[PDB]
Amino acid sequence: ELKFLVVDDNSTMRRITRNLLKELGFNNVEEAEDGVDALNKLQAGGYGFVISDWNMPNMDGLELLKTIRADGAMSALPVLMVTAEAKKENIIAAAQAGASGYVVKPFTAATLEEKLNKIFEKLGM
């Protein structure tokens, strides 16, 4: 099934996220610790959905998005962006960069499932 890549420099939050997906019925989850590490794996190919935090070292979430978007082979990857902030100028940034959606943390498996389904709905999966 859908192979997810959870990107976040916080080991705990990657853990929570990995678990909410597990609960939602997605056990094919892999993880990365920053944009650079994420891209290193994405280039290997095989991932179907990307969930990344906004603030990370080396390569943050927004640059990780622009890069993914600019790479013809990774251009089609749905990227769900996780922010701590509610709705400032970030959501516009992600919107312009081409995010598939955002979700403020922390979140419940219910909020997550709803966002996943809105995205799944637009792409038709």
From Swiss-Prot:
Pfam families linked to this entry: Response_reg
Annotated Gene3D superfamilies: 3.40.50.2300
Binding annotation for Mg(2+): D8, D9, D53, N55
Keywords: Acetylation, Chemotaxis, Cytoplasm, Flagellar rotation, Magnesium, Metal-binding, Phosphoprotein, Two-component regulatory system
GO molecular function list: metal ion binding
InterPro entries listed in its UniProt record: CheY-like_superfamily, Sig_transdc_resp-reg_receiver, ST_Response_Regulator
PTM per Swiss-Prot/TrEMBL: Phosphorylated by CheA or acetylated by acetyl-CoA synthetase, depending on which acetate metabolism pathway is available.
Gene Ontology BP annotations: archaeal or bacterial-type flagellum-dependent cell motility; chemotaxis; phosphorelay signal transduction system
Keyword Metal-binding: yes
Location in the cell: Cytoplasm
Response regulatory domain sequence ranges: 3-120
Chain positions found as 4-aspartylphosphate: D53
Cofactor(s) required, per the database record: Mg(2+)
Cofactor info, note text: Binds 1 Mg(2+) ion per subunit.
Modification sites for N6-acetyllysine: K88, K105
GO (cellular component) term, any one: cytoplasm
Entry annotated with the keyword ATP-binding: no
General function of this protein: Involved in the transmission of sensory signals from the chemoreceptors to the flagellar motors. In its active (phosphorylated or acetylated) form, CheY exhibits enhanced binding to a switch component, FliM, at the flagellar motor which induces a change from counterclockwise to clockwise flagellar rotation.
Protein name according to UniProt: Chemotaxis protein CheY
